[PDB]
């Protein structure tokens, strides 16, 4: 109840495949500081369950080594709202997407939500997309955000943007 962008009519299949986390933001800079932060993971890919729910696999700086750890995003009343009894937070928001370039959502804690709000920009290919950048940035405007990262397309193939 702080994002205030959600997409009208989300078809959770048509979000399935490969995407790219090419830019993050949070409204706390320890939320995403280092490689090691909480909060620092990368999409590789979402699949859609058939029962309505959606599978996410993403890498992350676990010890010392990139892991790649399987999330699963249980749907909701509201088809662009997913709950994860997962990291720290819970809910899963998707704002805004075209389904063949970009997609954007945001993490959000139901109780501490303000110190807990993370959101991506997630493209289809490994380029630096401005149309996206953009979409993202403006929905963005309204969120108290701290930190932001962006990536570079030779990163953007690293496993872990190493």
């Given at each position: 109840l702080i994002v205030t962008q959600t997409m009208k009519?989300?078809?959770?299949?048509?979000?399935a495949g490969t995407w790219y986390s090419l830019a993050m933001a949070a409204?706390?800079?320890?939320?995403?500081?280092?490689?090691?932060?909480?909060?620092?993971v990368y999409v590789e890919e979402l699949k859609p369950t058939p029962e309505g729910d959606l599978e996410i696999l993403l890498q992350k700086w676990e010890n010392d080594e990139c892991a790649q750890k399987k999330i699963i995003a249980e749907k909701t009343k509201i088809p662009a709202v997913f709950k994860i009894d997962a990291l720290n937070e819970n809910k899963v928001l998707v704002?805004?997407?075209?389904?063949k370039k970009y997609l954007l959502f945001c993490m959000e804690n139901s109780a501490e939500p303000e110190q807990s709000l993370v959101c991506q920009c997630l493209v289809r290919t490994p380029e630096v997309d401005d149309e996206a950048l953009e979409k993202f940035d403006k929905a963005l405007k309204a969120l108290p955000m701290h930190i932001r990262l962006s990536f570079n397309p030779t990163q953007l193939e690293e496993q872990c943007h190493i």
């Amino acid at each position: 109840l702080i994002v205030t962008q959600t997409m009208k009519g989300l078809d959770i299949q048509k979000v399935a495949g490969t995407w790219y986390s090419l830019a993050m933001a949070a409204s706390d800079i320890s939320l995403l500081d280092a490689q090691s932060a909480p909060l620092r993971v990368y999409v590789e890919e979402l699949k859609p369950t058939p029962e309505g729910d959606l599978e996410i696999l993403l890498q992350k700086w676990e010890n010392d080594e990139c892991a790649q750890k399987k999330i699963i995003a249980e749907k909701t009343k509201i088809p662009a709202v997913f709950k994860i009894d997962a990291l720290n937070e819970n809910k899963v928001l998707v704002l805004d997407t075209d389904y063949k370039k970009y997609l954007l959502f945001c993490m959000e804690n139901s109780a501490e939500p303000e110190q807990s709000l993370v959101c991506q920009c997630l493209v289809r290919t490994p380029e630096v997309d401005d149309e996206a950048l953009e979409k993202f940035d403006k929905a963005l405007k309204a969120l108290p955000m701290h930190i932001r990262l962006s990536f570079n397309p030779t990163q953007l193939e690293e496993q872990c943007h190493i």
